[PDB]
DNA sequence: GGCTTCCTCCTGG
DNA sequence: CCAGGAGAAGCC
């Protein structure tokens, strides 16, 4: 789950939690990436004022603090009709006053449920790069940040210090749309290439948001994917069979003709 | 930055 | 029949 998927979950849950009250949480396995925060256990009758996002983190605004939720590699969020019985990987619920439930499912348990009084200060949000859809992320910034790099552009795009929300899928997809070889040294991109890359990253992410993100009710974006997970298949633009490689042991996909 | 690691569930081979 | 793949900390 990357920024589009996380953004999709935020919009899907917002109209259901905003204005409603958390009676309490139900935890059936608190051993996530980190231990579930104490304060989540103690939650009692708290109204949700807002549902926001920072990077791949969802933020529930409560009066005295914030619930920080991360989906990791296999987490998801559902608002359930009512006292629907949980499944073995349904590790955390938010029992709402409106009779609905916020149900979190996460087989690998690489997700997280954390509490912070103030968003600012430290915690997992500190040191996060700029939002890619923000004006803070642009070609001149990108160019600036690459000049000292010594490695490939593709893993660099997936580095939250440079920018947030672009994970394995949209890193490969964005470079395709920009026509940039993922093995290209980051330092070797031109200001112009940086400018186009930042532009297509926004377009690609905004597109997947619009269609509910990628499904690996599911998402409708997997069918618009140009390169990710299409090894051997013909490039939708030129037919040359899609090539697969790896960066930091994550799969990366590209078209050896459309990308240079 | 690259590699490995947490954890469980399919599946391609 | 099953090893291998499927965010980001915490090493380097
Ligand atoms: Zn092509």
DSSP string, A20-39: -EEEEEEES--BSSSBPPHH
Compute, in degrees rounded to 10, the torsion defined by CA atoms A48, A50, A56, A57: -40
Q: Is the CB of A1 under 7 A from strand C?
A: yes
Per DSSP, A241 falls in state: B
How far apart (Å, rounded) are the C-alpha atoms in residues A197 and A177? 8
Helices (H), chain A: 3-17, 38-42, 139-146, 153-157, 168-177, 191-210
Neighbours of A72 (CB within 10 A): 15
The helix or strand, by DSSP H or E, that contains position A254, with its residue range, turns out to be: strand A250-254
Domains belonging to chain A, first-starting first, are 1-117 (3.20.190.10), 138-260 (1.10.8.50)
Q: Do A173 and A226 form a contact (C-beta atoms < 8 A)?
A: yes
β partners of residue A123: none
| Strand B CB-contacts below 7 Å | A 33, 74, 88-89, 107-110, 149, 151-152, 155-156, 159, 162, 246-249
> What SS3 state is found at A77?
strand
Per DSSP, A215 falls in state: -
Per DSSP, A172 falls in state: H
Crossing angle between the packed helical segments A191-210 and A3-17, to the nearest 10 degrees: 40
Q: In what order do the strands lie in the sheet with A57-61?
A: A50-54, A57-61, A66-70, A112-116
How far apart (Å, rounded) are the C-alpha atoms in residues A23 and A44? 5
Q: Is the CB of A108 under 7 A from strand C?
A: yes
φ, ψ for residue A199 (rounded to 5)?
Answer: -65, -50
Residues whose CB is less than 8 angstroms from the CB of residue A107 and which lie 6 or more positions away in sequence, other chains included: A74, A89
Resolution in A: 2.1
Whether A61 sits among the annotated catalytic residues: the reply is no
A21-27 vs A46-47, strand pairing mode: antiparallel
Strand positions, DSSP E, A62-216: 66-70, 76-80, 92-96, 101-105, 112-116
Residues whose CB is less than 8 angstroms from the CB of residue A40 and which lie 6 or more positions away in sequence, other chains included: A25, A27, A67, A92, A113, A114, A115
Q: Do A194 and A220 form a contact (C-beta atoms < 8 A)?
A: no
How far apart (Å, rounded) are the C-alpha atoms in residues A206 and A195? 17
Q: Do A252 and A245 form a contact (C-beta atoms < 8 A)?
A: yes
Question: Most distant CA pair in chain A: distance in Å?
Answer: 58
Give the technique used to solve this structure.
X-ray
Q: Is the CB of A158 under 7 A from strand C?
A: yes
Number of H helices, E strands in chain A: 6, 11
Per DSSP, A240 falls in state: P
How far apart (Å, rounded) are the C-alpha atoms in residues A210 and A119? 27
Gaps after residue numbers in chain A (C–N over 2.5 angstroms): 216
Q: Do A191 and A199 form a contact (C-beta atoms < 8 A)?
A: no
């Amino acid at each position: 789950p990357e920024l589009p998927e996380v953004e999709t979950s935020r919009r899907g849950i917002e109209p259901h939690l905003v204005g409603a009250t958390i009676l309490h949480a139900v935890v059936r396995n608190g051993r996530l990436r980190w231990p579930v925060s104490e304060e989540i256990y103690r939650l009692s009758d708290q109204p949700v004022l807002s549902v926001q996002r920072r990077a791949k983190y969802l933020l529930l605004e409560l009066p005295e603090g914030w619930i920080i939720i991360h989906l990791g590699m296999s987490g998801s969020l559902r608002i359930l009709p009512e006292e629907l019985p949980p499944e073995k990987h349904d590790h955390v619920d938010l029992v709402m006053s409106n009779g609905k439930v916020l149900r979190y499912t996460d087989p690998r348990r690489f997700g997280a449920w954390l509490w912070t009084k103030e968003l600012e200060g430290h915690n997992v949000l500190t040191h996060l790069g700029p939002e890619p859809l923000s004006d803070d992320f642009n070609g001149e910034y990108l160019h600036q940040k690459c000049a000292k790099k010594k490695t490939a552009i593709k893993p660099w795009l997936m580095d939250n210090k440079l920018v947030v929300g672009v994970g394995n899928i949209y890193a490969s997809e964005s470079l395709f749309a920009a026509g940039i070889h993922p093995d290209r040294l980051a330092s070797s991109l031109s200001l112009a290439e940086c400018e186009l890359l930042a532009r297509v990253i926004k377009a690609v992410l905004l597109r997947s948001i619009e269609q509910g993100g990628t499904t690996l009710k599911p998402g409708y974006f997997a069918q618009e994917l140009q390169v990710y997970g299409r090894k051997g298949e013909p490039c939708r633009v030129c037919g040359t069979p899609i090539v697969a490689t790896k960066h930091a042991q994550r799969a990366t996909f590209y078209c050896r003709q459309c990308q240079k």
